[PDB]
Design an enzyme around this catalytic site. Structure first.
Site, PDB file in Angstrom:
ATOM      1  CG  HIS A  61      -1.725  -1.212   1.405  1.00 41.85           C
ATOM      2  ND1 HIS A  61      -2.026  -1.688   2.660  1.00 41.85           N
ATOM      3  CD2 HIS A  61      -2.273  -2.080   0.524  1.00 41.85           C
ATOM      4  CE1 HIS A  61      -2.743  -2.788   2.542  1.00 41.85           C
ATOM      5  NE2 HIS A  61      -2.896  -3.058   1.259  1.00 41.85           N
ATOM      6  CG  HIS A  87       2.300   5.689   5.463  1.00 44.49           C
ATOM      7  ND1 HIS A  87       1.777   5.624   6.735  1.00 44.49           N
ATOM      8  CD2 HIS A  87       1.381   6.337   4.711  1.00 44.49           C
ATOM      9  CE1 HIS A  87       0.589   6.209   6.752  1.00 44.49           C
ATOM     10  NE2 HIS A  87       0.322   6.641   5.532  1.00 44.49           N
ATOM     11  CG  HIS A  89      -0.332   8.491   0.768  1.00 43.75           C
ATOM     12  ND1 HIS A  89      -1.113   7.356   0.668  1.00 43.75           N
ATOM     13  CD2 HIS A  89      -0.230   8.764   2.089  1.00 43.75           C
ATOM     14  CE1 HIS A  89      -1.456   6.957   1.883  1.00 43.75           C
ATOM     15  NE2 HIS A  89      -0.939   7.797   2.762  1.00 43.75           N
ATOM     16  CD  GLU A  99      -3.818   9.473   1.158  1.00 47.28           C
ATOM     17  OE1 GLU A  99      -4.387   8.584   0.507  1.00 47.28           O
ATOM     18  OE2 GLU A  99      -3.772   9.456   2.401  1.00 47.28           O
ATOM     19  CG  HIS A 112      -0.007  10.522   5.756  1.00 47.67           C
ATOM     20  ND1 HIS A 112      -0.989   9.765   5.150  1.00 47.67           N
ATOM     21  CD2 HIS A 112      -0.188  11.794   5.331  1.00 47.67           C
ATOM     22  CE1 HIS A 112      -1.736  10.550   4.394  1.00 47.67           C
ATOM     23  NE2 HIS A 112      -1.271  11.785   4.481  1.00 47.67           N
ATOM     24  CB  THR A 193      -6.332   8.125   3.994  1.00 48.67           C
ATOM     25  OG1 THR A 193      -4.980   7.646   3.891  1.00 48.67           O
ATOM     26  CG2 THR A 193      -6.357   9.529   4.654  1.00 48.67           C
TER      27      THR A 193
HETATM   28 ZN   LIG Z   1      -3.794  -4.828   0.658  1.00 48.89          ZN
HETATM   29 ZN   LIG Z   2      -1.211   7.758   4.823  1.00 45.06          ZN
END
Ligand SMILES: [Zn+2]
Ligand SMILES: [Zn+2]
Ligand SMILES: [Cl-]
Ligand SMILES: [Cl-]
Ligand SMILES: [Zn+2]
Length: 260
Positions: A61, A87, A89, A99, A112, A193
């Protein structure tokens, strides 16, 4: 458990993802409410030594860095936290992937740093509780110079390119991944999120951005693979409706420009 762009939509697996007070949201600074009660953020313990090392994991992710004990973050009286992990995005070649948006505009990427309230011993106790979790968020933009702090992480992405891979990296100054201005930020109440999308999360979004080189932004979005055969790109959630929420600002109005 899941990949971006995958099926089914999240509310199918976690109905809370269809809640009324979700994140991320669009920030319209002209509508943000100035609150002089919002003091500069206070961080301690973020300057980590080179050893011991930290786990850096491609979880399909995002790429997630596990943080050690002792990173304390204070939003104000009665609002104190400990950092758990950070982490990112991002988008894809030429395409932005933050985001949060500002006046409807999307930034290249977003960091984040996820925190647990000192009122709770474990995340699962804090989930869904107002103020139980807090996230610090900053936009990453393109700049002319290589960002030396981010290079510490970006240079290690190739060795965890495949989903589920992990590696150990030297400790670093976690605050050097964040803007230097701790006094100017936006704040609102929203959700995680990603599933389970639990609400009651306090979001703080820096007004100041951080700059990475074009090459660095490319490394971030071009290196990692996701679940199945997928590419780990465009790993951001669509903007969510504010539904009557107020976004607060820690600083007053001010004009972006002025005639001579
Ligand atoms: Zn997954
Ligand atoms: Zn995040
Ligand atoms: Cl709701
Ligand atoms: Cl707007
Ligand atoms: Zn515009």
């Amino acid at each position: 458990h899941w990949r971006y762009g995958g099926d089914p939509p999240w509310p199918r697996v976690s109905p809370a993802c269809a809640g009324r007070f979700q994140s991320p949201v669009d920030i319209r600074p002209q509508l943000a409410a100035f609150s002089p009660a919002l003091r500069p953020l206070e961080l301690s313990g973020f300057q980590l030594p080179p050893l011991p090392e930290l786990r850096l994991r491609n979880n399909g992710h995002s790429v997630q860095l596990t943080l050690p004990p002792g990173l304390e973050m204070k939003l104000g009286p009665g609002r104190e936290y400990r950092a758990l992990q950070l982490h990112l995005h991002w988008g894809a070649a030429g395409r932005p992937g933050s985001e949060h948006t500002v006046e409807g505009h999307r930034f290249p990427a977003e960091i984040h740093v996820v925190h647990l309230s000192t009122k709770y011993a474990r995340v699962d106790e804090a989930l869904g509780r107002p103020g139980g979790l807090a996230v610090l968020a900053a936009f990453l933009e393109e700049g002319p110079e290589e960002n030396s702090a981010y290079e510490q992480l970006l240079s290690r992405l190739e060795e965890i390119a495949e989903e589920g891979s992990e590696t150990q990296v030297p400790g670093l100054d976690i605050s050097a991944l964040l803007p230097s201005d701790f006094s100017r930020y936006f704040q609102y109440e929203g959700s995680l999120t990603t599933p389970p999308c639990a609400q009651g999360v306090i979001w703080t979004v820096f007004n100041q951005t951080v700059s990475l080189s074009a090459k660095q932004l490319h490394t971030l979005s071009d290196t990692l693979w996701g679940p199945g055969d997928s590419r780990l790109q465009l790993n951001f959630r669509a903007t969510q409706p504010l539904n009557g929420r107020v976004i607060e600002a820690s600083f007053p109005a001010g004009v972006d420009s002025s005639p001579r």
